[PDB]
Design an enzyme around this catalytic site. Sequence first.
Site, short mmCIF file in Angstrom:
data_model
loop_
_atom_site.label_atom_id
_atom_site.label_comp_id
_atom_site.label_asym_id
_atom_site.label_seq_id
_atom_site.Cartn_x
_atom_site.Cartn_y
_atom_site.Cartn_z
CG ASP A 25 -1.99 1.06 1.18
OD1 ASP A 25 -1.98 1.93 0.29
OD2 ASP A 25 -2.90 1.00 2.02
CB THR A 26 2.32 3.17 -2.88
OG1 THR A 26 1.14 3.43 -3.68
CG2 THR A 26 3.06 1.90 -3.40
N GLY A 27 -0.09 4.16 -0.70
CA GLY A 27 -0.85 5.23 -0.04
C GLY A 27 -0.84 5.21 1.47
#
Lengths: 99, 99
Positions: A25-27
């Site tokens: 999850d880059t967010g």
Amino acid sequence: PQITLWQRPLVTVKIGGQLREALLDTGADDTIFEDINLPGKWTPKMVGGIGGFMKVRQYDQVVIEICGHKVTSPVLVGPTPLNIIGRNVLTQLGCTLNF
Amino acid sequence: PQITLWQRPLVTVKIGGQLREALLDTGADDTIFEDINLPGKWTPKMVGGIGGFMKVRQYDQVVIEICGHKVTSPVLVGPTPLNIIGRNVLTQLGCTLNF
Ligand SMILES: CC(C)CN(C[C@@H](O)[C@H](Cc1ccccc1)NC(=O)O[C@H]1CO[C@H]2OCC[C@H]21)S(=O)(=O)c1ccc(N)cc1
Ligand SMILES: [Cl-]
Ligand SMILES: [Cl-]
């Protein structure tokens, strides 16, 4: 390892001796787990999200076995809907977004 | 373009003629904005996140200009804390996670 995105990028992890699935999850700034019990002292934090906030426990220096990599990170524990692997751990796997 | 993850992977986007900053979010199934108003009819939907749920409008067939690419996608509008670009748009950029 190159991973496309037509499906949720879920990986299997070993964290604190337990086997879990988690989302790349880059967010997410920080790595957080719902369904685990970590050993040791913790610090109260909060995380804010799409629909609100929640109280969490920050456990420092936690061993995570993810992909072929073995890494330490602070780990947040609280009632997230899914385990998430955040940029604090993604950076240590040398993870990059490419297009 | 290869993007590391030591900072939030924020990108500039043109959407419905307006300029916005948004987050490349592999943990998001869907694309959602907070600070815009899109033209036309919409469908009531909901999204669930770390801290709860919220009501959103789904606008279909919305043009997004994101880095070099120009793509259509359904777009959710609602009270998110940040704008997020999710897998529905990331796949169209040929975006992958690499390590
Ligand atoms: C938690 C995931 C299962 C899904 N979330 C995407 C996630 O990347 C959000 C995306 C996000 C980012 C900022 C604010 C709200 C939501 N990040 C997030 O909650 O991260 C928290 C953990 O570390 C911190 O980093 C950012 C906030 C903290 S989500 O925002 O709720 C979400 C859910 C559904 C859709 N369609 C799109 C997004
Ligand atoms: Cl650490
Ligand atoms: Cl579309």
